[PDB]
Ligand binder design. Structure first.
Ligand code: CL
Ligand code: ZN
Lengths: 267, 4
């Protein structure tokens, strides 16, 4: 994998449809707890525990406390240099007739916060709910999301479970349903939305340059988007603090934090 | 394709 910024810039200057795949490293560079590293524990657990169908079926109140806390911290976190570079590039290139699109693995909406408009959130969003009864999805930014979660979600180890009864957790406001809401967040072991994936496949087919930023390239099928693209002639360039299992299959690899290497790459 |  090449590490020449000059070569990538030559592809970039000539690229017309740029696909950027961003992972949890970009949010971590904003101080956003990922609960996947190195990236924070929530009282005893990480996202491999609470972000599962298992955790929600066993203790939906604990799963809601977890996500309520993450919603609440997003009011203190800001987009970093990588977000701004990615957003600014999209606007500058959009005026030149060139399209930049961000396929993100994260749910904290920091890309949208920076001004990115072409955003595909393959794993959902902290600020969208889904009804476990009728399936309707809704944006939701209310703090707290429901009254019984007010002041809840404290992340400190040894903090007592809210144990909120299911009827007082966020409920579907669609008339006639009142079903139990869950975060519109793809959990481990759930199938991604086929419509979003069809939109992703459409972007991967028409793009002529691909960037993979802040991704450990171990979460599927998100780690499969890039190799499917490189195998069409399209250059793939990785921006990550470390080498991932998919490094040897990329045209470029730029070691470093995304906030250091992306502003130079997207300039 | 399920989320690993
Ligand atoms: Cl709202
Ligand atoms: Zn409903």
């Amino acid at each position: 994998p090449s590490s020449s910024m000059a070569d990538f810039r030559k592809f970039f200057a000539k690229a017309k449809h740029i696909v950027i795949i961003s992972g949890a490293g970009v949010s971590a560079e904003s101080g956003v707890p990922t609960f996947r590293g190195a990236g924070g524990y929530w009282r005893k657990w990480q996202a491999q525990d609470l972000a599962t169908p298992l955790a929600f079926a066993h203790n939906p109140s604990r799963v809601w406390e977890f996500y309520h806390y993450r919603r609440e911290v997003m009011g203190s976190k800001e987009p970093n240099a990588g977000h701004r570079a990615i957003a600014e590039c999209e606007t500058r290139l959009g005026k030149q007739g060139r399209r930049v699109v961000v396929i993100t693995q994260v749910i904290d909406e920091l890309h949208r916060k920076a001004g990115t408009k072409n955003l595909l959130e393959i794993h959902g969003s902290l600020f969208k709910t889904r009804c476990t009864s009728c399936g309707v999805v809704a944006e939701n930014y209310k703090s707290p999301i429901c009254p019984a979660l007010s002041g809840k979600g404290a992340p400190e180890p040894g903090t007592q479970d809210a144990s909120i009864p299911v009827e007082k957790l966020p409920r579907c406001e669609e008339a006639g349903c009142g079903g139990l809401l869950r975060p519109h967040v793809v959990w481990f072991g759930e199938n991604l939305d086929p419509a979003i994936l069809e939109e992703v496949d459409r972007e991967l087919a028409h793009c002529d340059l691909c960037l993979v930023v802040g991704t450990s390239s171990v979460v599927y099928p998100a780690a499969m988007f890039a190799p499917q693209v490189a195998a069409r002639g399209v250059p793939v360039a990785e921006f990550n603090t470390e080498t991932t299992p998919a490094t040897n299959r990329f045209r470029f690899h730029f070691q470093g934090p995304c906030g250091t290497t992306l502003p130079e790459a997207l300039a | 394709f399920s989320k690993q």
